[PDB]
């Protein structure tokens, strides 16, 4: 049944551009969990269904990934490291709580949290994550996971009644992101409902 | 019945 999920995300990558979102219009809220939207551009007229939580979350998440400077623990005695890979070590390390002094590398600060421990395996993970484009928003899995939970907890809840103003912001915000088809947990943000091409509606009132 | 207007 997962093929129906794949073709949905495949359709979105071709049918929906960054600008397409800015021109989308909110129809209303469906079952207190969905935003029904229209998109009419050129000869294309389609309805899309947006998940209010997942779409709000993908925005908050991507914002945290790009802007947040993670808090670090200023080390008591600096620790060295050997690489090769040395040319990769970018101020993406400073954003991830790695203040450095630059095989002769010097680790001045390590990121810290009251709910998790950070090590050299995370610094090397971030060294390998750059190997796999935009590199300024790259985060080590530990940090990424924490931002994914921050976004999930702060975002619009399913079952929350929303007004046009809020729903409009939620949809339009998606134009700021690259291919925002999924939330950080891999859940879909939106899907195409139907194309409104040939709907020959009632017109008797203008007929003579 | 029938309408007065239609006679």
């Amino acid at each position: 049944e997962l093929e129906d999920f794949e073709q949905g995300e495949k359709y979105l990558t071709l049918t929906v551009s960054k600008n397409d979102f800015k021109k989308m219009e909110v129809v209303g809220q469906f079952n207190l969990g969905f935003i029904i939207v229209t998109r009419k551009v050129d000869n294309k007229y389609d309805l899309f269904i947006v998940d209010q939580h997942a779409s709000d979350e993908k925005y908050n998440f991507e914002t945290l990934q790009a802007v947040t400077v993670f808090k670090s623990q200023k080390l008591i005695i600096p620790q060295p490291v050997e690489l090769s890979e040395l040319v990769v070590l970018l101020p993406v390390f400073e954003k991830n709580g790695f203040k450095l002094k630059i095989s002769r590398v010097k680790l001045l600060s390590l990121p810290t949290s009251k709910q998790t421990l950070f090590d050299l395996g995370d610094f090397n993970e971030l060294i390998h994550l750059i190997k796999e484009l935009r590199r300024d928003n790259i985060r080590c899995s530990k940090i990424r996971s924490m931002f994914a939970m921050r976004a999930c907890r702060s975002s619009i809840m399913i079952g929350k009644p929303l007004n046009k103003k809020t729903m409009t912001r939620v949809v339009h915000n998606l134009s700021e992101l690259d291919k925002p088809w999924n939330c950080p947990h891999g859940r879909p943000t939106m899907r195409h409902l139907m194309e409104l091409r040939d709907w020959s509606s009632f017109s008797k009132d203008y007929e003579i | 019945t029938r309408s007065k207007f239609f006679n």
Partner: protein, 264 residues
């Protein structure tokens, strides 16, 4: 209050009763209004239980106003169309001037003559009040003073008044009591359907500033009309005829949606 002893109205009420779709009527009786999809094509989205429907409200309002007309026949309230501004009056001859095929004063006068001779009944039965400002025979001075008030909180747009008069004068079979009565109720219902609002491009810098806020205002007035006046009435009293199944379309269902959209 007036009891309709008439045989014509009863036959038309029975005809409505014979077309009632039980299941489709339940869908409207328990609708949960979502919003407007297209103000031009007149499509609205509603939720019924686990399904999302696309409705053609042009078609639904048509049957709704037709049904209201049938029920309140000879007991309608009035929408008084006249102000202290005499220049704002609605002249039937002036309305028929929108039709280029009525290329002579006489052809427009032909239509006004039929309508005008039937003014006593149009007023009594339908609350469609016509008045003459000058001498009785001056068809060019025949005016529309009142229209029937079908729904409290609703005043129809008068953009379609030319069509109302043209069809009253050309489409209504004035010779047969039942066909005439049905015809007038159909004309009232047609005029009463909210207007088609064509799409205007808000992104186009080529289109004027005043044309924008004016489209936005028409877009808002319908959304508010459908949401606060129309759909609550549809939900409360609408009897769905079987010929309307083509106008109600299931577009999504929660069981299917919840197989793609899942919790984080």
């Amino acid at each position: 209050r007036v009891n309709v002893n008439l045989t014509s109205i009863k036959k038309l009420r029975e005809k409505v009763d014979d077309s009632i779709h039980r299941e489709l009527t339940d869908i409207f009786a328990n609708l949960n209004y979502v919003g407007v999809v297209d103000e031009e094509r007149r499509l609205a989205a509603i939720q019924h239980d686990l399904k999302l429907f696309l409705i053609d409200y042009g078609s639904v309002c048509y049957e709704l106003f037709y049904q209201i007309g049938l029920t309140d026949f000879a007991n309608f309230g009035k929408i008084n169309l006249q102000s202290t501004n005499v220049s704002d009056d609605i002249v039937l001859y002036n309305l028929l001037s929108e039709f280029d095929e009525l290329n002579d004063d006489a052809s427009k006068e032909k239509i006004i003559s039929k309508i005008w001779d039937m003014s006593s009944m149009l007023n009594e039965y339908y609350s469609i009040e016509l008045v003459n400002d000058g001498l009785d025979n001056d068809l060019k001075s025949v005016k529309l003073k009142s229209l029937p008030l079908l729904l409290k909180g609703y005043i129809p747009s008068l953009v379609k008044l030319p069509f109302f008069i043209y069809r009253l004068g050309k489409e209504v079979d004035w010779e047969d009591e039942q066909e005439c009565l049905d015809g007038i109720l159909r004309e009232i219902a047609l005029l009463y359907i909210p207007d088609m609002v064509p799409k205007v491009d808000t992104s186009d810098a080529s289109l004027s500033e005043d044309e924008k806020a004016q489209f936005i205002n028409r877009k808002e007035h319908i959304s508010s009309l459908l949401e606060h006046v129309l759909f609550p009435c549809i939900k409360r009293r609408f009897l769905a005829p079987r010929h309307i199944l083509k106008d109600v379309v299931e577009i999504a269902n929660l069981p299917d949606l919840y197989k793609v959209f899942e919790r984080c």
